[PDB]
Design a protein around this ligand. Structure first.
Ligand SMILES: OC[C@H]1O[C@H](O)[C@H](O)[C@@H](O)[C@@H]1O
Ligand SMILES: OC[C@H]1O[C@](O)(CO)[C@@H](O)[C@@H]1O
Length: 411
């Protein structure tokens, strides 16, 4: 592999425009419904195949979610005078993240199928985001996911989906295989950075190559703050914009790995496809859409993970290329594909662009009056974007949590 990474540059970031109507999510209505009064969900991982297509099994649409319990009645989460503090609860959720699954014949109105892995199966208590892949017409599934604290390790667990006429259940998911961790030469380690990023496996079979790959979030290797900003990372900045502040501490990247064979048992770490040194620290949940012979690389990020003297909205950013290993071009010239409106900047997150143009999100925080907001923990309205060359256009909206399958497999 003789390739060079594409840099997302400060010059690119300066082009990022908030509240572009073609590139901005509709405003979440504060009277939004919730899909469960018992649990929170946020990161949503639809069941798909190695080609990236959303798959239904025996007419059942399937999604996996990062999940946690609503502590409505637990005394630990009580306000002064003994009231349930929904906010403190919601914001403490990442520590108790578990992966659950839901099912529906309609892609809507989801039924809770419960927990994927029994407690104690995951090496780490935290089960963070990844991808469920349908291996088989017998229903076998490899759940790639992230084991966090201690450390950060990409891993997989095999199981199996069994459908009935009116319900769906899971078998297996009893043994987790750790695949790899940050190496220190290419991707940044805990040793080098206590706040290092390493998570979110999205496996895929390349159509031109036939080989098994995966994207993941990472940081560029090196001790924290040792990265320097050269004119490469700067890009072709305008006069008066040479001041980068503490940009040295932002070193986000989209990592790449390749499997020895399609079983996905052993993985060789490769150089990153996208690096954002001096621009953004977090390029999370990377994922591909394959369209018009092109590689559409999407990755989500935050307003407040941008480097100094740079800004953008919370949402999904994107890059397009003719080949897997680049060179990539930022979507819509700046990289921004779908951003939250500035009036409700944190209404949604974890935008997952599917090959049918549908984009799913979970509702985080919707403003009401002054400093108070309503928290969600439920799916946002699914939007459709249209991809055209290196430009995206939002095109219409569907119902809350609408995640239809593109293809049905009979077992
Ligand atoms: O754990 C901190 C989290 O805060 C919010 O939920 C953000 O949406 C999420 O991206 C971030 O990681
Ligand atoms: O638990 C949620 C975690 O997973 C992500 O959504 C993607 O990596 C991050 O935003 C967060 O740290």
């Amino acid at each position: 592999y003789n390739y060079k990474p594409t840099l997302w540059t400060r010059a690119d970031a300066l082009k990022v425009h908030e509240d572009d109507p073609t590139t901005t999510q509709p405003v979440i209505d504060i009277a939004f419904p919730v899909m469960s009064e018992e649990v929170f969900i946020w990161d949503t991982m639809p069941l798909r195949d190695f080609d990236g297509e959303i798959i239904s099994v025996n007419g059942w649409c399937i999604i996996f979610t990062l999940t946690a319990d609503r502590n409505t009645d637990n005394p630990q989460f009580q306000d002064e005078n003994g009231n349930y503090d929904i906010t403190r609860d919601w914001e403490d959720r990442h520590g108790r993240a578990r992966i659950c699954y839901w099912y529906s014949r309609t892609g809507k109105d989801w039924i809770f199928g419960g927990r994927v892995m029994a407690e104690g199966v995951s090496p780490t208590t935290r089960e963070w985001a990844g991808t469920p892949i349908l291996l088989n017409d017998r229903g076998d599934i490899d759940l790639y996911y992230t084991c966090v604290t201690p450390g950060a390790t990409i891993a997989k667990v095999r199981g199996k989906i069994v459908t009935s006429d009116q319900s769906v259940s899971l078998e297996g998911f009893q043994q987790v295989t750790s695949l790899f961790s940050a190496d220190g030469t290419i991707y940044q380690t805990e040793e080098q950075n206590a706040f290092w990023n390493f998570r979110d496996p999205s496996p895929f079979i390349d159509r031109n190559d036939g080989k098994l790959y995966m994207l993941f979030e990472g940081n560029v290797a090196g001790p924290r703050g040792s990265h320097e900003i050269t004119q490469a990372e700067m890009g072709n900045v305008p006069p008066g914009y040479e001041d980068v502040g503490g940009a040295k501490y932002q070193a986000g990247c989209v990592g790449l790995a390749v499997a020895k064979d399609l079983s996905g048992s052993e993985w060789q770490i490769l150089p990153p496809l996208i690096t954002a040194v001096g621009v953004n620290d977090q390029t999370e949940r990377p994922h591909f859409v394959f369209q018009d012979g092109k590689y559409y690389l999407f990755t989500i990020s935050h307003k407040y993970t941008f480097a100094d003297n740079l800004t953008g909205p919370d949402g999904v950013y994107g890059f397009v290329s003719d080949k897997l290993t680049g060179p990539y071009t930022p979507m819509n010239s700046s990289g921004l594909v779908l951003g939250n409106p500035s009036s409700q900047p944190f209404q949604t997150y974890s935008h997952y662009v599917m090959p049918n143009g549908l984009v799913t999100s979970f509702i985080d925080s919707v403003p009401w009056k002054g400093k108070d907001y309503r928290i969600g923990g439920t799916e946002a309205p699914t939007v459709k974007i249209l991809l055209k060359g290196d430009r995206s256009f939002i095109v219409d909206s569907f119902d809350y949590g609408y995640i239809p399958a593109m293809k049905d497999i009979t077992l």
